[PDB]
């Protein structure tokens, strides 16, 4: 997260870190056994880390649970990034408490201008790299479809939306992929892609979770 702030320990209790000997992507806990992330984050050997603040210190409240299933959307396109969503089933159910909690799926899509919370352990610099120990947060608005398509001609599908800023300086960045965009208490987005990070006229692009609620429910119910 570039241009954000330190969230505070366990203030984003649905945020997870996907770990393979290092933090590589985020995710969102949606029930005690299932995490939503991005399809491009798929790999073997994922350990889900819940309850984290400082990802490099065991501070208390962590739960480390192996992924038992990683389900990439069958229609994920690795070139256009359409359908950039993955469901991870945990090997055992997480213990839910104030510091580890699920986030609700949306009942409707969110309108342009709605304020959202984007969070993660990604790079905090728009030029160069600095990776934080503790979780970072950014308040960012949903942008209009017409502004999103103007920024990224020919690249925005019906399953994507833009959020953030056009003036530069505030955005999600590398290491934030798969993590949450939460608006009015609902998970509306998954960090996906952009042209660089925090660049003028190039806002972040996010998977539109409202389009996948039925798919998520059907997949969980059958697994």
């Amino acid at each position: 997260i570039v241009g954000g702030y330190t969230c505070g320990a366990n203030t984003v209790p649905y945020q997870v870190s996907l770990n393979s000997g290092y933090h590589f992507c985020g995710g969102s806990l949606i029930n005690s056994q299932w995490v939503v992330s991005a399809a491009h984050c798929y790999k073997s050997g994922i350990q889900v880390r819940l309850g984290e603040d400082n990802i490099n210190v065991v501070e208390g409240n962590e739960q480390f649970i192996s992924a038992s299933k990683s389900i990439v959307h069958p229609s994920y396109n690795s070139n256009t990034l359409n359908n950039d969503i993955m469901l991870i089933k945990l090997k055992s159910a997480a213990s839910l408490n104030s510091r580890v909690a699920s986030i609700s799926l949306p009942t409707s899509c969110a309108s342009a201008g709605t304020q959202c919370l984007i969070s993660g352990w990604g790079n905090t610099k728009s030029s160069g790299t600095s990776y934080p120990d503790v979780l970072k947060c950014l308040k960012a608005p949903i942008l209009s479809d017409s502004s999103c398509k103007s920024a990224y001609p020919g690249q925005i599908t019906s399953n994507m939306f833009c959020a953030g800023y056009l003036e530069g300086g505030k955005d999600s960045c590398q290491g934030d992929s798969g993590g949450p965009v939460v608006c009015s208490g609902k998970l509306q987005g998954i960090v996906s892609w952009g042209s660089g990070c925090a660049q003028k006229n190039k806002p972040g692009v996010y998977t539109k979770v409202c389009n996948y609620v039925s798919w998520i429910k059907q997949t969980i119910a059958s697994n």
Partner: peptide, 14 residues
Amino acid sequence: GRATKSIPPIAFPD
């Protein structure tokens, strides 16, 4: 020019 926000990033010619 597009790149994903994973570690490591996946980038594309555009």
